[PDB]
Amino acid sequence: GHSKWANTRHRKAAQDAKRGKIFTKIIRELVTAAKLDANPRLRAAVDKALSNNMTRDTLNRAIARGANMETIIYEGYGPGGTAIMIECLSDNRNRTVAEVRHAFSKCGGNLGTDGSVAYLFSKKGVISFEKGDEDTIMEAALEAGAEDVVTYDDGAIDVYTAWEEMGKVRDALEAAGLKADSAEVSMIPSTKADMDAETAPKLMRLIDMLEDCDDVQEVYHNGEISDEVAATL
């Protein structure tokens, strides 16, 4: 009872309503990495920009910006006792932590020590196929170096790679006539947080408030959902 759109339907139907905020968070992550100009920190941003439909000239002009903002991560728990990580970028640490702290209060939750639920998360590249031949994609993926392949109930396919190889793998599948629909780099949970029609929209409200903050670059969670309940939100 677990499809891919079930853990991507909601919020992804909300992030496509806050495109200004999403566009501009990417911009800051591009400019800051170019100002660094550090290389393997620009790459990530660029890929995120593409997957979000940001034109090339726009990204190039952002990087071509090569205001002291720093990166900061937070951790906590939320609806249904669901683990959560928050990645930020800001020039004001205290204002950032307050806004993040405010979200949890308004959603019954609490931040924690830097090492709490983090160990429950592994940073890896994910190349997704919304459809296709499973055994052919799997072999081409493992062949290219992939670390694992997941096939969901809706035929969607997720290829996991070492976070820093998502690119080589993605390209291999393409040159092989096996184009992925998306290929990003996220934080994958090694555990499941069951959710009901009660502790889901509640969690989803937290992700919404957190993502509403301009300092919040990334929000990850293990609140696995089911097709059964996903049809209540």
Side-chain angles (χ1 to χ4, degrees), residues 5-11 13-21:
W5 58 267
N7 300 69
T8 62
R9 184 113 295 185
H10 22 293
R11 179 164 80 159
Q15 302 213 199
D16 299 1
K18 295 170 279 170
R19 185 167 172 64
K21 286 182 156 184

PDB file of all heavy atoms in Angstrom, residues 5-21, unseen atoms left out:
ATOM      1  N   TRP A   5       3.867   8.627  -5.478  1.00  0.00           N
ATOM      2  CA  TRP A   5       3.125   9.888  -5.406  1.00  0.00           C
ATOM      3  C   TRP A   5       2.501  10.092  -4.030  1.00  0.00           C
ATOM      4  O   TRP A   5       2.063  11.195  -3.707  1.00  0.00           O
ATOM      5  CB  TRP A   5       2.021   9.947  -6.463  1.00  0.00           C
ATOM      6  CG  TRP A   5       1.025   8.832  -6.360  1.00  0.00           C
ATOM      7  CD1 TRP A   5       1.058   7.637  -7.023  1.00  0.00           C
ATOM      8  CD2 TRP A   5      -0.143   8.794  -5.524  1.00  0.00           C
ATOM      9  NE1 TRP A   5      -0.010   6.859  -6.655  1.00  0.00           N
ATOM     10  CE2 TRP A   5      -0.762   7.539  -5.734  1.00  0.00           C
ATOM     11  CE3 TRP A   5      -0.719   9.693  -4.613  1.00  0.00           C
ATOM     12  CZ2 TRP A   5      -1.941   7.163  -5.067  1.00  0.00           C
ATOM     13  CZ3 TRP A   5      -1.892   9.316  -3.948  1.00  0.00           C
ATOM     14  CH2 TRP A   5      -2.484   8.060  -4.180  1.00  0.00           C
ATOM     15  N   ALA A   6       2.463   9.031  -3.224  1.00  0.00           N
ATOM     16  CA  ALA A   6       1.890   9.091  -1.881  1.00  0.00           C
ATOM     17  C   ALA A   6       2.793   9.856  -0.917  1.00  0.00           C
ATOM     18  O   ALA A   6       2.326  10.426   0.074  1.00  0.00           O
ATOM     19  CB  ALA A   6       1.651   7.674  -1.353  1.00  0.00           C
ATOM     20  N   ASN A   7       4.089   9.858  -1.202  1.00  0.00           N
ATOM     21  CA  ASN A   7       5.046  10.556  -0.357  1.00  0.00           C
ATOM     22  C   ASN A   7       5.612  11.746  -1.121  1.00  0.00           C
ATOM     23  O   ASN A   7       6.712  12.228  -0.820  1.00  0.00           O
ATOM     24  CB  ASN A   7       6.183   9.615   0.060  1.00  0.00           C
ATOM     25  CG  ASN A   7       5.690   8.404   0.846  1.00  0.00           C
ATOM     26  OD1 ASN A   7       5.015   7.527   0.304  1.00  0.00           O
ATOM     27  ND2 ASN A   7       6.024   8.358   2.133  1.00  0.00           N
ATOM     28  N   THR A   8       4.860  12.214  -2.115  1.00  0.00           N
ATOM     29  CA  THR A   8       5.287  13.350  -2.922  1.00  0.00           C
ATOM     30  C   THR A   8       4.112  14.166  -3.468  1.00  0.00           C
ATOM     31  O   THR A   8       4.315  15.239  -4.027  1.00  0.00           O
ATOM     32  CB  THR A   8       6.158  12.898  -4.115  1.00  0.00           C
ATOM     33  OG1 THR A   8       5.392  12.038  -4.966  1.00  0.00           O
ATOM     34  CG2 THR A   8       7.391  12.155  -3.631  1.00  0.00           C
ATOM     35  N   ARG A   9       2.890  13.657  -3.311  1.00  0.00           N
ATOM     36  CA  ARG A   9       1.701  14.360  -3.796  1.00  0.00           C
ATOM     37  C   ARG A   9       1.564  15.688  -3.056  1.00  0.00           C
ATOM     38  O   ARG A   9       1.788  16.757  -3.626  1.00  0.00           O
ATOM     39  CB  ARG A   9       0.447  13.512  -3.560  1.00  0.00           C
ATOM     40  CG  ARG A   9      -0.832  14.113  -4.121  1.00  0.00           C
ATOM     41  CD  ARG A   9      -1.387  13.283  -5.280  1.00  0.00           C
ATOM     42  NE  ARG A   9      -0.497  13.288  -6.434  1.00  0.00           N
ATOM     43  CZ  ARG A   9      -0.775  12.721  -7.604  1.00  0.00           C
ATOM     44  NH1 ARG A   9      -1.931  12.088  -7.788  1.00  0.00           N
ATOM     45  NH2 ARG A   9       0.104  12.799  -8.595  1.00  0.00           N
ATOM     46  N   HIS A  10       1.185  15.611  -1.786  1.00  0.00           N
ATOM     47  CA  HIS A  10       1.041  16.803  -0.961  1.00  0.00           C
ATOM     48  C   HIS A  10       2.397  17.510  -0.895  1.00  0.00           C
ATOM     49  O   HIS A  10       3.440  16.901  -1.163  1.00  0.00           O
ATOM     50  CB  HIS A  10       0.563  16.417   0.441  1.00  0.00           C
ATOM     51  CG  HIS A  10       0.849  14.991   0.796  1.00  0.00           C
ATOM     52  ND1 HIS A  10       0.242  13.933   0.155  1.00  0.00           N
ATOM     53  CD2 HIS A  10       1.705  14.448   1.694  1.00  0.00           C
ATOM     54  CE1 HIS A  10       0.711  12.798   0.643  1.00  0.00           C
ATOM     55  NE2 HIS A  10       1.600  13.081   1.578  1.00  0.00           N
ATOM     56  N   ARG A  11       2.368  18.788  -0.536  1.00  0.00           N
ATOM     57  CA  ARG A  11       3.562  19.632  -0.461  1.00  0.00           C
ATOM     58  C   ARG A  11       4.107  19.950  -1.852  1.00  0.00           C
ATOM     59  O   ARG A  11       4.437  21.100  -2.134  1.00  0.00           O
ATOM     60  CB  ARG A  11       4.687  19.011   0.387  1.00  0.00           C
ATOM     61  CG  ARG A  11       5.921  19.917   0.400  1.00  0.00           C
ATOM     62  CD  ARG A  11       6.936  19.610   1.484  1.00  0.00           C
ATOM     63  NE  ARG A  11       7.818  18.481   1.188  1.00  0.00           N
ATOM     64  CZ  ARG A  11       9.003  18.288   1.770  1.00  0.00           C
ATOM     65  NH1 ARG A  11       9.453  19.150   2.675  1.00  0.00           N
ATOM     66  NH2 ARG A  11       9.742  17.231   1.452  1.00  0.00           N
ATOM     67  N   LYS A  12       4.205  18.938  -2.714  1.00  0.00           N
ATOM     68  CA  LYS A  12       4.695  19.152  -4.074  1.00  0.00           C
ATOM     69  C   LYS A  12       3.593  19.829  -4.884  1.00  0.00           C
ATOM     70  O   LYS A  12       3.810  20.270  -6.014  1.00  0.00           O
ATOM     71  CB  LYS A  12       5.078  17.836  -4.710  1.00  0.00           C
ATOM     72  N   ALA A  13       2.406  19.886  -4.285  1.00  0.00           N
ATOM     73  CA  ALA A  13       1.237  20.527  -4.880  1.00  0.00           C
ATOM     74  C   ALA A  13       1.095  21.864  -4.161  1.00  0.00           C
ATOM     75  O   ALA A  13       0.209  22.665  -4.462  1.00  0.00           O
ATOM     76  CB  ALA A  13      -0.005  19.672  -4.649  1.00  0.00           C
ATOM     77  N   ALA A  14       1.983  22.072  -3.193  1.00  0.00           N
ATOM     78  CA  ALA A  14       2.017  23.284  -2.381  1.00  0.00           C
ATOM     79  C   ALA A  14       3.255  24.105  -2.747  1.00  0.00           C
ATOM     80  O   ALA A  14       3.218  25.341  -2.750  1.00  0.00           O
ATOM     81  CB  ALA A  14       2.047  22.913  -0.891  1.00  0.00           C
ATOM     82  N   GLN A  15       4.350  23.410  -3.054  1.00  0.00           N
ATOM     83  CA  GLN A  15       5.592  24.070  -3.436  1.00  0.00           C
ATOM     84  C   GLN A  15       5.409  24.688  -4.815  1.00  0.00           C
ATOM     85  O   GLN A  15       6.163  25.573  -5.222  1.00  0.00           O
ATOM     86  CB  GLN A  15       6.759  23.070  -3.453  1.00  0.00           C
ATOM     87  CG  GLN A  15       6.991  22.364  -2.110  1.00  0.00           C
ATOM     88  CD  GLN A  15       8.455  22.040  -1.827  1.00  0.00           C
ATOM     89  OE1 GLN A  15       8.761  21.194  -0.985  1.00  0.00           O
ATOM     90  NE2 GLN A  15       9.362  22.724  -2.513  1.00  0.00           N
ATOM     91  N   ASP A  16       4.399  24.215  -5.535  1.00  0.00           N
ATOM     92  CA  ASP A  16       4.119  24.739  -6.859  1.00  0.00           C
ATOM     93  C   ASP A  16       3.095  25.862  -6.737  1.00  0.00           C
ATOM     94  O   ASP A  16       2.298  26.093  -7.646  1.00  0.00           O
ATOM     95  CB  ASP A  16       3.609  23.619  -7.773  1.00  0.00           C
ATOM     96  CG  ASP A  16       4.642  22.502  -7.958  1.00  0.00           C
ATOM     97  OD1 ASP A  16       5.733  22.602  -7.353  1.00  0.00           O
ATOM     98  OD2 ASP A  16       4.369  21.530  -8.700  1.00  0.00           O
ATOM     99  N   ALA A  17       3.135  26.546  -5.592  1.00  0.00           N
ATOM    100  CA  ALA A  17       2.257  27.673  -5.284  1.00  0.00           C
ATOM    101  C   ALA A  17       3.116  28.752  -4.616  1.00  0.00           C
ATOM    102  O   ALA A  17       2.721  29.921  -4.486  1.00  0.00           O
ATOM    103  CB  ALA A  17       1.139  27.231  -4.335  1.00  0.00           C
ATOM    104  N   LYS A  18       4.300  28.327  -4.196  1.00  0.00           N
ATOM    105  CA  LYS A  18       5.273  29.190  -3.546  1.00  0.00           C
ATOM    106  C   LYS A  18       6.550  29.216  -4.406  1.00  0.00           C
ATOM    107  O   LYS A  18       7.670  29.191  -3.890  1.00  0.00           O
ATOM    108  CB  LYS A  18       5.573  28.637  -2.146  1.00  0.00           C
ATOM    109  CG  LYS A  18       4.355  28.672  -1.195  1.00  0.00           C
ATOM    110  CD  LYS A  18       4.606  27.901   0.103  1.00  0.00           C
ATOM    111  CE  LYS A  18       4.411  26.406  -0.084  1.00  0.00           C
ATOM    112  NZ  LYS A  18       4.884  25.610   1.094  1.00  0.00           N
ATOM    113  N   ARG A  19       6.371  29.272  -5.721  1.00  0.00           N
ATOM    114  CA  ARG A  19       7.514  29.275  -6.621  1.00  0.00           C
ATOM    115  C   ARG A  19       8.475  30.448  -6.430  1.00  0.00           C
ATOM    116  O   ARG A  19       9.661  30.323  -6.717  1.00  0.00           O
ATOM    117  CB  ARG A  19       7.049  29.210  -8.079  1.00  0.00           C
ATOM    118  CG  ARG A  19       8.204  29.088  -9.056  1.00  0.00           C
ATOM    119  CD  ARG A  19       7.741  28.714 -10.466  1.00  0.00           C
ATOM    120  NE  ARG A  19       8.839  28.787 -11.433  1.00  0.00           N
ATOM    121  CZ  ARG A  19       9.929  28.024 -11.413  1.00  0.00           C
ATOM    122  NH1 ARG A  19      10.089  27.105 -10.463  1.00  0.00           N
ATOM    123  NH2 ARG A  19      10.860  28.169 -12.365  1.00  0.00           N
ATOM    124  N   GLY A  20       7.969  31.585  -5.972  1.00  0.00           N
ATOM    125  CA  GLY A  20       8.837  32.727  -5.744  1.00  0.00           C
ATOM    126  C   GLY A  20       9.832  32.386  -4.642  1.00  0.00           C
ATOM    127  O   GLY A  20      11.042  32.565  -4.783  1.00  0.00           O
ATOM    128  N   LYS A  21       9.317  31.874  -3.532  1.00  0.00           N
ATOM    129  CA  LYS A  21      10.164  31.501  -2.416  1.00  0.00           C
ATOM    130  C   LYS A  21      11.143  30.381  -2.812  1.00  0.00           C
ATOM    131  O   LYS A  21      12.310  30.417  -2.437  1.00  0.00           O
ATOM    132  CB  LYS A  21       9.292  31.086  -1.226  1.00  0.00           C
ATOM    133  CG  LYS A  21       8.625  32.281  -0.549  1.00  0.00           C
ATOM    134  CD  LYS A  21       7.804  31.888   0.669  1.00  0.00           C
ATOM    135  CE  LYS A  21       7.666  33.084   1.612  1.00  0.00           C
ATOM    136  NZ  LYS A  21       6.942  32.740   2.871  1.00  0.00           N
TER     137      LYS A  21
END
